[PDB]
Design a protein around this motif. Structure first.
Motif, short mmCIF file in Angstrom:
data_model
loop_
_atom_site.label_atom_id
_atom_site.label_comp_id
_atom_site.label_asym_id
_atom_site.label_seq_id
_atom_site.Cartn_x
_atom_site.Cartn_y
_atom_site.Cartn_z
N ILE A 278 120.77 167.25 97.45
CA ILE A 278 121.45 167.60 98.69
C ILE A 278 121.95 169.03 98.54
O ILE A 278 122.77 169.32 97.65
CB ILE A 278 122.60 166.64 99.00
CG1 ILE A 278 122.07 165.21 99.19
CG2 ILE A 278 123.34 167.09 100.24
CD1 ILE A 278 120.77 165.15 99.96
N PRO B 142 118.00 160.47 92.69
CA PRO B 142 118.51 160.85 94.01
C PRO B 142 118.00 162.21 94.43
O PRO B 142 117.93 163.14 93.60
CB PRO B 142 120.04 160.87 93.81
CG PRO B 142 120.27 160.04 92.59
CD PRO B 142 119.08 160.27 91.72
N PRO B 143 117.62 162.38 95.69
CA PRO B 143 117.15 163.69 96.15
C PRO B 143 118.29 164.70 96.15
O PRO B 143 119.46 164.35 96.29
CB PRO B 143 116.65 163.41 97.57
CG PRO B 143 117.41 162.21 98.00
CD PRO B 143 117.62 161.38 96.77
N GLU C 278 130.42 171.09 102.60
CA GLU C 278 130.03 169.79 103.15
C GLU C 278 128.68 169.90 103.83
O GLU C 278 128.44 170.84 104.59
CB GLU C 278 131.09 169.29 104.13
CG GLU C 278 132.46 169.10 103.52
CD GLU C 278 132.66 167.71 102.95
OE1 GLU C 278 131.69 166.93 102.94
OE2 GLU C 278 133.79 167.39 102.53
N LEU C 279 127.80 168.93 103.57
CA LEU C 279 126.48 168.92 104.19
C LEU C 279 126.15 167.53 104.72
O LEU C 279 126.62 166.53 104.19
CB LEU C 279 125.40 169.35 103.19
CG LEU C 279 125.52 170.76 102.64
CD1 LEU C 279 124.47 171.00 101.58
CD2 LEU C 279 125.39 171.78 103.75
N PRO C 280 125.33 167.45 105.77
CA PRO C 280 124.97 166.13 106.32
C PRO C 280 124.19 165.30 105.31
O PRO C 280 123.43 165.84 104.50
CB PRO C 280 124.12 166.48 107.54
CG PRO C 280 124.50 167.87 107.89
CD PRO C 280 124.79 168.55 106.59
N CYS C 281 124.38 163.99 105.37
CA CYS C 281 123.67 163.06 104.50
C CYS C 281 123.74 161.67 105.12
O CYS C 281 124.34 161.48 106.18
CB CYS C 281 124.24 163.07 103.07
SG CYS C 281 126.01 162.75 102.95
N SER C 282 123.11 160.71 104.45
CA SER C 282 123.11 159.33 104.91
C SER C 282 123.46 158.40 103.75
O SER C 282 123.02 158.60 102.62
CB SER C 282 121.75 158.94 105.50
OG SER C 282 120.73 159.02 104.52
N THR C 283 124.27 157.38 104.06
CA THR C 283 124.79 156.48 103.05
C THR C 283 124.75 155.06 103.58
O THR C 283 124.40 154.82 104.74
CB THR C 283 126.23 156.85 102.66
OG1 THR C 283 126.54 156.28 101.38
CG2 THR C 283 127.21 156.32 103.69
N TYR C 284 125.07 154.11 102.71
CA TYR C 284 125.23 152.71 103.11
C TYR C 284 126.72 152.42 103.24
O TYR C 284 127.45 152.45 102.25
CB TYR C 284 124.58 151.78 102.09
CG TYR C 284 123.08 151.91 101.96
CD1 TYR C 284 122.25 151.59 103.02
CD2 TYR C 284 122.50 152.33 100.78
CE1 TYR C 284 120.88 151.69 102.90
CE2 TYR C 284 121.14 152.45 100.66
CZ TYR C 284 120.33 152.12 101.72
OH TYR C 284 118.97 152.24 101.59
N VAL C 285 127.16 152.12 104.47
CA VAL C 285 128.58 151.84 104.67
C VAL C 285 128.93 150.45 104.15
O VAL C 285 128.07 149.61 103.87
CB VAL C 285 128.98 151.99 106.15
CG1 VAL C 285 129.11 153.45 106.51
CG2 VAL C 285 127.95 151.31 107.04
#
Ligand SMILES: *[C@@H]1O[C@H](CO)[C@@H](O[C@@H]2O[C@H](CO)[C@@H](O[C@@H]3O[C@H](CO)[C@@H](O)[C@H](O[C@H]4O[C@H](CO)[C@@H](O)[C@H](O)[C@@H]4O)[C@@H]3O)[C@H](O)[C@H]2NC(C)=O)[C@H](O)[C@H]1NC(C)=O
Ligand SMILES: *[C@@H]1O[C@H](CO[C@@H]2O[C@@H](C)[C@@H](O)[C@@H](O)[C@@H]2O)[C@@H](O[C@@H]2O[C@H](CO)[C@@H](O[C@@H]3O[C@H](CO)[C@@H](O)[C@H](O)[C@@H]3O)[C@H](O)[C@H]2NC(C)=O)[C@H](O)[C@H]1NC(C)=O
Lengths: 48, 52, 53, 105, 49, 53
Positions: F27, F24-25, F41-48
């Protein structure tokens, strides 16, 4: 290929996609039905 | 069926009447020069835009 | 919705390693592994159909 | 224990008497469970991930787990010029040496 | 004498909607400022380009 | 590597293993191994989890 900008588009919703990934199809192995290829990995991921 | 004066080496058999359609995976051969299409499946779990 | 798999069936596919170091035709086979998410979640595509019997 | 052949059972010495136990209980482990490719009598053929210890264990008749651990640097030599971690779909074939699954004296 | 036809192409993934890098050109900058002034003993705040 | 498997109706195991570099990269600016009790808290992207179209 393999660098930032290997795939480009004017806007995220646009369907105009320019791609230079050096995609070369390779001979499938004997007795198998797979589709092998030699493709430079995503330049965006490598940049990331 | 039975076919006389024959060897198992020199015959080919397959199942043809497929009543269901499967994903056109690159790991199965294609039926013809064009695709049958005829079904569609949405890919679940879309990418979404969260905090870590 | 779950009602999309009405007329679909799973398929056997070639797998380079069936557990004993020998390639074989398996009921489960990995098609694509997508890791676009930055939190590490993996979306694995397999020849099985889960949730529909 | 009756000197007969049964591939679903093994015999372990319990005190002074041989006793019988299930083969499915047998496990081989270095850092993740190894895949046992074969068994015959005293000898087990397995494929193991990279690790430095190796343990063999089973469950006996009284449902009591037994295991033994030895230090052993398991690092397969690199075949070819690339250090791959799993068998690939497409590639080349090179000479190597393995243990064929034949029990023929 | 059997043949296999292999065809493939490259598309932008759906993840391009969310995970992407925007390449921009930059032009002159519209400077803005926020300033606090002690005017006759009163703190006043101004915001101007 | 990545191995996906299951148990057959006849109580036999099926599995498929593919070479796949999973890492995983990072964050943020810290290489952590599990999300902490106290932090940022930082922005990220996930699979809902959503299964809709
Ligand atoms: C996740 O969060 C990120 C940031 O928090 C967010 O990134 C933004 O994505 C949108 C695309 O939906 C980018 O475009 C913006 O979207 C609005 C929608 O109201 C549009 O009006 C704009 O798009 C146009 O902007 C360009 C500017 O010249 C136009 O040339 C072009 O035609 C675009 O259509 C507006 O820019 C937006 O730029 C980014 N933000 C950044 C900082 O990059 C993302 O949308 C969020 N959602 C998802 C699902 O990822
Ligand atoms: C006008 O504003 C100035 C500075 O602007 C201030 O900026 C922030 C700090 C916020 O407080 C804003 O609301 C505010 O506008 C004021 O000067 C500053 O006043 C504060 C009062 O809290 C001073 O802090 C004190 O400092 C002393 C010594 O360190 C401490 O012992 C106190 O406990 C307290 O923390 C601050 O030093 C001072 N800064 C200066 C003088 O440079 C000013 O009071 C204000 N005047 C009016 C009439 O509103």
């Amino acid at each position: 290929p393999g660098q930032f900008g290997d795939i480009q588009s004017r806007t995220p919703e646009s369907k105009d996609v320019y791609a230079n990934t050096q995609l070369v199809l390779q001979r499938p192995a004997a007795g198998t039905v797979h589709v092998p290829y030699s493709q430079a990995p995503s330049g965006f991921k490598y940049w990331l | 069926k039975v076919i006389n004066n024959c060897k198992v080496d020199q015959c080919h058999a397959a199942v043809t009447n497929h009543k269901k359609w499967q994903y056109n995976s690159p790991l199965v051969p294609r039926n013809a020069e064009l695709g049958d299409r005829k079904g569609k499946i949405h890919i679940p779990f879309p990418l979404a835009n969260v905090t870590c | 919705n779950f009602n999309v798999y009405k007329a679909t069936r799973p398929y056997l596919a070639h797998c380079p390693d069936c557990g004993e170091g020998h390639s074989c035709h398996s009921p489960v086979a990995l098609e694509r592994i997508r890791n676009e998410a930055t939190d590490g979640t993996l979306k694995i595509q397999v020849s099985l159909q889960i949730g529909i019997k | 224990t009756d000197d007969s052949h049964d591939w679903t059972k093994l015999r372990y010495m319990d005190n002074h008497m041989p006793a019988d136990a299930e083969r499915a209980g047998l496990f081989v482990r270095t850092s993740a469970p190894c895949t046992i490719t074969g068994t015959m009598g005293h000898f087990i053929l397995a494929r193991c991930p990279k690790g430095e210890t190796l343990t063999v264990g089973f469950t006996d008749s009284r449902k009591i787990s037994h295991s033994c651990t030895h230090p052993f640097h398991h690092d397969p030599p690199v075949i070819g010029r690339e250090k791959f971690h799993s068998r690939p779909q497409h590639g080349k074939e090179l000479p190597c040496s393995t243990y064929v699954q034949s029990t023929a004296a | 004498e059997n043949t296999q036809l292999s065809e493939a192409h490259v598309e932008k993934s759906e993840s391009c909607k969310t995970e992407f890098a925007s390449a921009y050109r930059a032009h002159t900058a519209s400077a803005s400022a926020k300033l606090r002034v002690l005017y006759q003993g009163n703190n006043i705040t101004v915001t101007a380009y």
